[PDB]
Design a protein around this ligand. Sequence first.
Ligand SMILES: CCCCCCCCCO[C@@H]1O[C@H](CO)[C@@H](O)[C@H](O)[C@H]1O
Ligand SMILES: CCCCCCCCCO[C@@H]1O[C@H](CO)[C@@H](O)[C@H](O)[C@H]1O
Length: 357
Amino acid sequence: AWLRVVTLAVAAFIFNTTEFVPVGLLSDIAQSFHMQTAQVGIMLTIYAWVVALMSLPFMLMTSQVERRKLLICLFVVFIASHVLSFLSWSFTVLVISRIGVAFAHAIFWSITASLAIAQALSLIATGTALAMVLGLPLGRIVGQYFGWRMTFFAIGIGALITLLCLIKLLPLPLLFRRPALMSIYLLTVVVVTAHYTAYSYIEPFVQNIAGFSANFATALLLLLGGAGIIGSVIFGKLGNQYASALVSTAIALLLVCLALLLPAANSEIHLGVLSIFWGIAMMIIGLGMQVKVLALAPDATDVAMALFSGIFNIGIGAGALVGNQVSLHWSMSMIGYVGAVPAFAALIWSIIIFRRW
Ligand SMILES: CCCCCCCCCO[C@@H]1O[C@H](CO)[C@@H](O)[C@H](O)[C@H]1O
Ligand SMILES: CCCCCCCCCO[C@@H]1O[C@H](CO)[C@@H](O)[C@H](O)[C@H]1O
């Protein structure tokens, strides 16, 4: 009935939760491995960049496989990797485990984007919604109380319990040429990097760079959650029209918040509002892209979305890596400004292609 989709929604919740979660566990993991909080962002780069390389191949090579059998194996790789993430003894192994999840993710996102056949985005994006506001926060909380490995194991078990309802299912190019969208692919990579230079380390920035608490951090990851929620629902209303404007402004705003990271770093209420805008910004620039890809590739959407998935993660890992370099070579404070550079260019490029198309 509904329940064959509802279970899938929870699956949507849980796979995003693990993706986000290590953004507010970097310090718990740092303590454990004896490496600076910035040094562990490789595990974000590797995750994304591995899910970048394989995203097309994997969903492609598995196109033959019936959906129930598919999701099963998929979820087995996930659950096992998490056990290994919990067991992990070297940061090498931790990242080996992350790669294990990467593969699971790679496959997954395109299967459900196919299995999504605004009644799918409704039940799925509620999963992804809840994956932000509960997932990462509680994820952060459990890491504080029970240690990160335990957090990972938790997910691991969660994936198992969701699976037995998934075991109650029945058995089931020219795009490069098209330069309307390859433009949109470009804007995506550029803009994402902007966000993920700063955001990826919003914890070590909050604690180490700014006068603030570990609980203030955990407060902020919630605040970017709801801002994400607000953002999503702002995009709900005026989404079919003005969307080009709404992305361009959202990038504009994103420019703003990045540049104003240290101007806000001393006001704990400023971060509070920075995050409310920042969060709304991203969600718009996120949802403006998806929507504009679906538009610019009705033919072979899965492939469009599969490709789109991969380039976003390129941008994540790139973001994460520059964020790592700034902190490791220069200083973690300036990730704000360094972020705002791609943010500007994207805001330029956005308006260029939007006013072009
Ligand atoms: C793994 C995901 C696939 C990447 C496609 C991203 C779209 C951006 C355009 O790609 C172009 O392709 C050239 C090939 O040589 C590169 O020189 C150059 O960087 C780039 O302008
Ligand atoms: C200048 C007018 C035309 C704008 C065209 C889009 C601008 C793209 C900027 O390039 C980016 O520069 C970063 C430098 O660190 C790289 O990390 C990143 O991967 C790369 O893609």
